[PDB]
Design a binder for this molecule. Structure first.
Ligand code: HEC
Length: 86
């Protein structure tokens, strides 16, 4: 995975709702490490699944983003949560 490419994908596709690791639609489901851990979402597998297929009001990105781009954005989230958002 490529977290740098991931940051590009995040900026273009995710920051509308998750700027600063928040969640503008469903406020407690943030991208902070502690919340990812709490919800079982602190892994590449988990983030890829949810980005790909969606969850409730979290959009699915299958088709929109290529599989590699989904992998890279997952890497970005994990890295950013580790470094800055928690
Ligand atoms: C609004 C239109 C959103 C956009 C754009 C993106 N996300 Fe999202 N995300 C959104 C919601 C409403 C939710 C909660 C879903 C639920 O009901 O549980 C989410 C959740 C996530 C999570 C998990 C967070 C956690 O459990 O604490 C992740 C990892 C996530 N979203 C990632 C993510 C990425 C990488 C995005 C762009 C490709 C993205 N989201 C866009 C709302 C919206």
């Amino acid at each position: 995975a490529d977290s740098v490419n991931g940051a590009k994908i995040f900026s273009a596709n995710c920051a509308s709702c998750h700027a600063g690791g928040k969640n503008l639609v469903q406020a407690q489901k943030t991208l902070k490490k502690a919340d990812l851990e709490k919800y079982g979402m602190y892994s590449a597998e988990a983030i890829i699944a949810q980005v790909t297929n969606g969850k409730n009001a979290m959009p699915a990105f299958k088709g929109r983003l290529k599989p590699e781009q989904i992998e890279d954005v997952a890497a970005y989230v994990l890295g950013k949560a580790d470094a800055d958002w928690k």
